[PDB]
Enzyme design. Structure first.
Site, PDB file in Angstrom:
ATOM      1  N   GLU A 176      -5.523  -5.490  -8.535  1.00 25.79           N
ATOM      2  CA  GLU A 176      -5.720  -4.770  -7.277  1.00 25.79           C
ATOM      3  C   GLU A 176      -6.658  -5.587  -6.392  1.00 25.79           C
ATOM      4  O   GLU A 176      -7.504  -6.342  -6.875  1.00 25.79           O
ATOM      5  CB  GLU A 176      -6.279  -3.340  -7.455  1.00 25.79           C
ATOM      6  CG  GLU A 176      -6.546  -2.855  -8.862  1.00 25.79           C
ATOM      7  CD  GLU A 176      -6.597  -1.307  -8.953  1.00 25.79           C
ATOM      8  OE1 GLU A 176      -7.410  -0.677  -8.226  1.00 25.79           O
ATOM      9  OE2 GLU A 176      -5.812  -0.713  -9.746  1.00 25.79           O
ATOM     10  N   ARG A 180      -8.100   3.290   6.620  1.00 26.34           N
ATOM     11  CA  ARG A 180      -9.545   3.452   6.567  1.00 26.34           C
ATOM     12  C   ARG A 180     -10.113   3.124   5.191  1.00 26.34           C
ATOM     13  O   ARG A 180      -9.392   3.143   4.194  1.00 26.34           O
ATOM     14  CB  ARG A 180      -9.891   4.880   6.921  1.00 26.34           C
ATOM     15  CG  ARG A 180      -9.363   5.276   8.261  1.00 26.34           C
ATOM     16  CD  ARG A 180      -9.887   6.648   8.648  1.00 26.34           C
ATOM     17  NE  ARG A 180      -9.843   6.884  10.089  1.00 26.34           N
ATOM     18  CZ  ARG A 180      -9.686   8.081  10.644  1.00 26.34           C
ATOM     19  NH1 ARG A 180      -9.531   9.160   9.871  1.00 26.34           N
ATOM     20  NH2 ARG A 180      -9.676   8.188  11.975  1.00 26.34           N
ATOM     21  N   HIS A 200       0.839  -1.193   0.000  1.00 24.25           N
ATOM     22  CA  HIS A 200       0.000   0.000   0.000  1.00 24.25           C
ATOM     23  C   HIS A 200       0.871   1.239   0.000  1.00 24.25           C
ATOM     24  O   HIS A 200       1.656   1.448   0.927  1.00 24.25           O
ATOM     25  CB  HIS A 200      -0.964   0.042   1.190  1.00 24.25           C
ATOM     26  CG  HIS A 200      -1.897   1.205   1.126  1.00 24.25           C
ATOM     27  ND1 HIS A 200      -3.117   1.144   0.484  1.00 24.25           N
ATOM     28  CD2 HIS A 200      -1.762   2.482   1.556  1.00 24.25           C
ATOM     29  CE1 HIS A 200      -3.701   2.326   0.539  1.00 24.25           C
ATOM     30  NE2 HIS A 200      -2.905   3.156   1.190  1.00 24.25           N
ATOM     31  N   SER A 255       1.816   0.161  -6.305  1.00 24.41           N
ATOM     32  CA  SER A 255       1.566   0.943  -5.083  1.00 24.41           C
ATOM     33  C   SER A 255       2.465   2.175  -4.998  1.00 24.41           C
ATOM     34  O   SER A 255       1.996   3.256  -4.687  1.00 24.41           O
ATOM     35  CB  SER A 255       1.795   0.088  -3.820  1.00 24.41           C
ATOM     36  OG  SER A 255       0.717  -0.797  -3.570  1.00 24.41           O
ATOM     37  N   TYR A 275       1.584   5.476  -6.205  1.00 24.74           N
ATOM     38  CA  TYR A 275       0.655   6.209  -5.343  1.00 24.74           C
ATOM     39  C   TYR A 275       1.368   7.004  -4.247  1.00 24.74           C
ATOM     40  O   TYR A 275       0.711   7.607  -3.429  1.00 24.74           O
ATOM     41  CB  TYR A 275      -0.357   5.243  -4.682  1.00 24.74           C
ATOM     42  CG  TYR A 275      -1.478   4.792  -5.599  1.00 24.74           C
ATOM     43  CD1 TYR A 275      -2.638   5.570  -5.769  1.00 24.74           C
ATOM     44  CD2 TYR A 275      -1.353   3.613  -6.345  1.00 24.74           C
ATOM     45  CE1 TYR A 275      -3.630   5.165  -6.618  1.00 24.74           C
ATOM     46  CE2 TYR A 275      -2.349   3.210  -7.227  1.00 24.74           C
ATOM     47  CZ  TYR A 275      -3.476   3.989  -7.358  1.00 24.74           C
ATOM     48  OH  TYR A 275      -4.473   3.551  -8.199  1.00 24.74           O
TER      49      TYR A 275
HETATM   50  N1  LIG Z   1      -6.065   6.728   8.386  1.00 25.31           N
HETATM   51  C1  LIG Z   1      -5.757   7.370   7.254  1.00 25.31           C
HETATM   52  N2  LIG Z   1      -5.209   8.602   7.337  1.00 25.31           N
HETATM   53  C2  LIG Z   1      -4.813   9.207   6.210  1.00 25.31           C
HETATM   54  N3  LIG Z   1      -4.890   8.767   4.951  1.00 25.31           N
HETATM   55  C3  LIG Z   1      -5.458   7.559   4.900  1.00 25.31           C
HETATM   56  C4  LIG Z   1      -5.910   6.806   5.973  1.00 25.31           C
HETATM   57  N4  LIG Z   1      -6.418   5.593   5.540  1.00 25.31           N
HETATM   58  C5  LIG Z   1      -6.257   5.633   4.240  1.00 25.31           C
HETATM   59  N5  LIG Z   1      -5.688   6.793   3.785  1.00 25.31           N
HETATM   60  C6  LIG Z   1      -5.434   7.166   2.401  1.00 25.31           C
HETATM   61  O1  LIG Z   1      -6.664   7.557   1.833  1.00 25.31           O
HETATM   62  C7  LIG Z   1      -6.580   7.397   0.415  1.00 25.31           C
HETATM   63  C8  LIG Z   1      -7.916   6.884  -0.125  1.00 25.31           C
HETATM   64  O2  LIG Z   1      -8.730   6.463   0.677  1.00 25.31           O
HETATM   65  N6  LIG Z   1      -8.183   6.913  -1.446  1.00 25.31           N
HETATM   66  C9  LIG Z   1      -7.340   7.427  -2.526  1.00 25.31           C
HETATM   67  C10 LIG Z   1      -6.995   6.296  -3.468  1.00 25.31           C
HETATM   68  N7  LIG Z   1      -8.213   5.689  -4.025  1.00 25.31           N
HETATM   69  C11 LIG Z   1      -7.889   4.610  -4.959  1.00 25.31           C
HETATM   70  C12 LIG Z   1      -6.819   3.648  -4.475  1.00 25.31           C
HETATM   71  O3  LIG Z   1      -6.715   3.347  -3.290  1.00 25.31           O
HETATM   72  N8  LIG Z   1      -6.043   3.135  -5.448  1.00 25.31           N
HETATM   73  C13 LIG Z   1      -5.117   2.072  -5.332  1.00 25.31           C
HETATM   74  C14 LIG Z   1      -5.191   0.989  -6.204  1.00 25.31           C
HETATM   75  C15 LIG Z   1      -4.256  -0.028  -6.103  1.00 25.31           C
HETATM   76  C16 LIG Z   1      -3.264   0.024  -5.139  1.00 25.31           C
HETATM   77  C17 LIG Z   1      -3.186   1.122  -4.283  1.00 25.31           C
HETATM   78  C18 LIG Z   1      -4.104   2.155  -4.356  1.00 25.31           C
HETATM   79  C19 LIG Z   1      -3.752   3.189  -3.325  1.00 25.31           C
HETATM   80  N9  LIG Z   1      -2.556   2.640  -2.718  1.00 25.31           N
HETATM   81  C20 LIG Z   1      -2.173   1.463  -3.250  1.00 25.31           C
HETATM   82  O4  LIG Z   1      -1.155   0.845  -2.952  1.00 25.31           O
HETATM   83  C21 LIG Z   1      -9.066   5.201  -2.936  1.00 25.31           C
HETATM   84  C22 LIG Z   1      -9.409   6.319  -1.981  1.00 25.31           C
HETATM   85  C23 LIG Z   1      -5.369   6.485   0.137  1.00 25.31           C
HETATM   86  O5  LIG Z   1      -4.320   7.185  -0.533  1.00 25.31           O
HETATM   87  C24 LIG Z   1      -4.929   6.025   1.533  1.00 25.31           C
HETATM   88  O6  LIG Z   1      -3.510   5.930   1.639  1.00 25.31           O
END
Ligand SMILES: Nc1ncnc2c1ncn2[C@@H]1O[C@H](C(=O)N2CCN(CC(=O)Nc3cccc4c3CNC4=O)CC2)[C@@H](O)[C@H]1O
Length: 248
Positions: free
Chosen positions: A225, A111, A95, A137, A140
């Site tokens: 994914e 979350r 991630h 990942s 991202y």
């Molecule tokens: N507790 C938290 N505090 C702050 N940020 C937080 C958190 N929990 C999750 N996040 C962050 O919120 C973001 C989020 O929800 N998003 C943004 C990304 N979006 C699509 C997505 O997740 N694509 C996606 C697809 C494939 C792999 C991966 C991702 C992201 N990371 C990976 O390795 C889904 C909604 C994400 O970038 C995560 O890192």
């Protein structure tokens, strides 16, 4: 005045953060409610995860390489208890995220995607997203030539039964019908032949190969994914401090 954290943990905290008797670093670290213990570069676990990172760096992501600077063990209090240990297909998955999010992530755990969605929706619904290709990942992390240090999170993910899907679908959580996660299928992925086990989770080591998957409708994903819709299917374990080396 003087910090009580290992120097390697100090430098980690400097990166994702920023007169008491407590060093301001120790303050930040304490307020994560999250153990971060450095691992030895010669330990098996360092070697395996180092291999995971490199062998599942995607071939079509040749615009950079990655170096593992430091490795950390993550133990978020409460996460082991909450974890769905009952479910099968437990995988250690990648991630990536922006630097500004790591305090949040280490403070509250991962979350599901926020409920006030963009108006199109999320690609595979409101869940937590993971990759088995390190570089999928890492894209991202939004690292740059200047900001070329980022973090990758490794987590045990209870996938259970996967609903396999060929294209994007905001209604993916609905399509589960009792199964425990969505798996978006990619043209390429690690294959089971090179898989390995680390502390009860499958680690899908590379190299990636063609999966023969094609979407008869539109665009097919380059790499898998995996999406789970309850945070209790996730247990953080490792935090990689990684260096991005951009080409020319
Ligand atoms: N507790 C938290 N505090 C702050 N940020 C937080 C958190 N929990 C999750 N996040 C962050 O919120 C973001 C989020 O929800 N998003 C943004 C990304 N979006 C699509 C997505 O997740 N694509 C996606 C697809 C494939 C792999 C991966 C991702 C992201 N990371 C990976 O390795 C889904 C909604 C994400 O970038 C995560 O890192």
């Amino acid at each position: 005045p003087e910090s009580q954290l290992d120097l390697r943990v100090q430098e980690l905290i400097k990166l994702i953060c920023n007169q008491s008797p407590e060093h301001p670093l120790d303050q930040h670290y304490r307020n994560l409610h999250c153990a971060l213990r450095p691992l030895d570069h010669e330990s098996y676990e360092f070697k395996v995860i180092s291999q995971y990172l490199q062998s599942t760096h995607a071939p079509t992501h040749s615009d950079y390489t990655m170096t593992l600077l430091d490795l950390f063990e993550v133990e978020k209090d409460g996460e082991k208890e909450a974890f769905r240990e009952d479910l099968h297909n437990r995988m250690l998955l990648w991630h990536g995220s922006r630097m500004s999010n790591w305090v949040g992530i280490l403070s509250h755990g991962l979350r599901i995607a926020p409920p006030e969605a963009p108006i199109t929706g999320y690609m595979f619904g409101k869940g937590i997203y993971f990759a088995d290709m390190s570089s999928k990942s890492a894209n991202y992390c939004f690292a740059s030539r200047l900001k070329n240090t980022g973090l990758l999170l490794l987590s045990e993910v209870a996938l259970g039964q996967c609903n396999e899907l060929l294209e994007a679908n905001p209604k993916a959580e609905g399509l589960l019908q009792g199964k425990h996660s969505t798996k978006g299928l990619g043209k390429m992925a690690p294959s089971s032949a090179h898989f390995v086990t680390l502390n009860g989770s499958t680690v899908p080591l590379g190299p990636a190969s063609d999966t023969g998957i094609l979407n008869p409708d539109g665009y097919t994903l380059n790499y898998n994914e995996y999406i789970v819709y309850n945070p209790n299917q996730v247990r953080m374990r490792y935090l990689l401090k990684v260096q991005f080396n951009f080409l020319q």
